[PDB]
Design a binder for this molecule. Structure first.
Ligand SMILES: CC(C)(C)c1onc([O-])c1C[C@H]([NH3+])C(=O)[O-]
Ligand SMILES: CC(C)(C)c1onc([O-])c1C[C@H]([NH3+])C(=O)[O-]
Lengths: 258, 258
């Protein structure tokens, strides 16, 4: 009965509340997806338990074992009933799990330490002094791996064989790398996160250029789940009521530090 | 075996080709949705016939008769197998027809004749000199009718009883009204159309302020339709290959013009 929700510790979607060490269950967390989960459960009429994904990954199919990891894996193998996180709707994923219509729109973007002489993806691909990478096991990495667009294919061929590795395990690692590399590392991540980080101290990073593509985040459920329909309608209702815009303003700018 | 596609004459989505009088079938038309339709059909493996919606409407449920009109109506009552056009994904529509994930992201926006002293929805609501309205039988009108955001509800309250009516039968009517009203009429329509018009002669209109909401267009099919799955996957694949961005750049090609 209690719906098992798989999510990921990614600010400001899901974060440990200040006094979390002495809190239990859902009360240990806070964030945009924590609020969204509450709204969805309310509209769909179910109780739930937020559970952080074991491997801390979004979801990718291992070319080798052919096994799915991350939150996608938790759904595919029946460990969770639903995923409420900034999970990107993609073709390979839609083939194994279901997604509600988007609750947020975004696109891949470039994050630089302020002052870095880079304005676009093309700029990056035409130089080698500044390294650049992306997150492991995510849609952004897969985007570059599959891209047939000249500039992106060129960037991928570079990234895939760069040393030391330009790929990071978590968004926090990528942000730290941009911040500590004196402008010698640029990070590729989704726009809304780029935007969120530009609002965090020490306010030394920024988004450059336009988005490389246009996609959306969706609430995912196992293929053919009984929750699919109700969740989808709930997301549409919440968006039309303006709750999603409200949630965005709350966690991004009302709590901004720059 | 031929799929009946319902669509609407709306530039640059679907337009009559030059010399269309001597052409027949699908060859009579050109535009973003015409090209999209060709791509979708190619990926899903089906032949199709483009048909222009009889009442020239997007789709709304008649308050009193309880009857869906426009392209939504054509799907609901079995007149068409699929709708390929700038049809907004909404809750009320999703309750009676199915939508693929969005193939385009956009939002409601404001169109003013250049020079109009208006910069936002709030500016519009705080005055009465400049009349403002929207398209009938569409998602934008329903947005205001149902919005509880003070500003939008305030706008709805004024629009509902203004004289002469601020609502128009077609987009062309609303645009023409902005252009002929010497700045005394502002029009509410979706962003990508506003931007399309802003780049064409006589170059006397412009989009002002940010978008009022965020949403997308989706390819629609009757509820439970067998075509649903394939069309959805096709849209995701086309977006991931960059075809959707290519079509946008093609039909919004900065035409020479302003
Ligand atoms: C952390 C976040 C969300 C900003 C992100 O930035 N680049 C990515 O690949 C992802 C993960 C992506 N949303 C997914 O679902 O794989
Ligand atoms: C004409 C177009 C497409 C610019 C538009 O702009 N405001 C609207 O309401 C619509 C129609 C809407 N997409 C729908 O499906 O009702």
């Amino acid at each position: 009965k209690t719906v098992v929700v798989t999510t990921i510790l990614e600010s400001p979607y899901v974060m440990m509340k200040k006094n979390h060490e002495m809190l239990e269950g859902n009360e240990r967390y806070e964030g945009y997806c924590v609020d969204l989960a509450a709204e969805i459960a309310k509209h769909c009429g179910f109780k739930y338990k937020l559970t952080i994904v074991g491997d801390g990954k979004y979801g990718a199919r291992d070319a080798d074992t052919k096994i799915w990891n991350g939150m996608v894996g938790e759904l595919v193998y029946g460990k969770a009933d639903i995923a409420i996180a900034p999970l990107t709707i993609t073709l390979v994923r839609e083939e194994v799990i279901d997604f509600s219509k988007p609750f947020m729109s975004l696109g891949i973007s470039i994050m630089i330490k302020k002052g870095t002489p880079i304005e676009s993806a093309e700029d990056l691909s035409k130089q080698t002094e500044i390294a650049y990478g992306t997150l492991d096991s995510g849609s952004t990495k897969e985007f570059f791996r599959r891209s047939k667009i000249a500039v992106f294919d060129k960037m991928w061929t570079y990234m895939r064989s760069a040393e030391p590795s330009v790929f990071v395990r978590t968004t926090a690692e990528g942000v730290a790398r941009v911040r500590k590399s004196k402008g010698k590392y640029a990070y590729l991540l989704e726009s809304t996160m780029n935007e969120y980080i530009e609002q965090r101290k020490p306010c030394d990073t920024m988004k450059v250029g336009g988005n490389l593509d246009s996609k959306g985040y969706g609430i995912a459920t196992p293929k053919g789940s009984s929750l699919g329909n109700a969740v989808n309608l709930a997301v549409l209702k919440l968006n039309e009521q303006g709750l999603l815009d409200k949630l965005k303003n709350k966690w991004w700018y009302d709590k901004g530090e720059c």
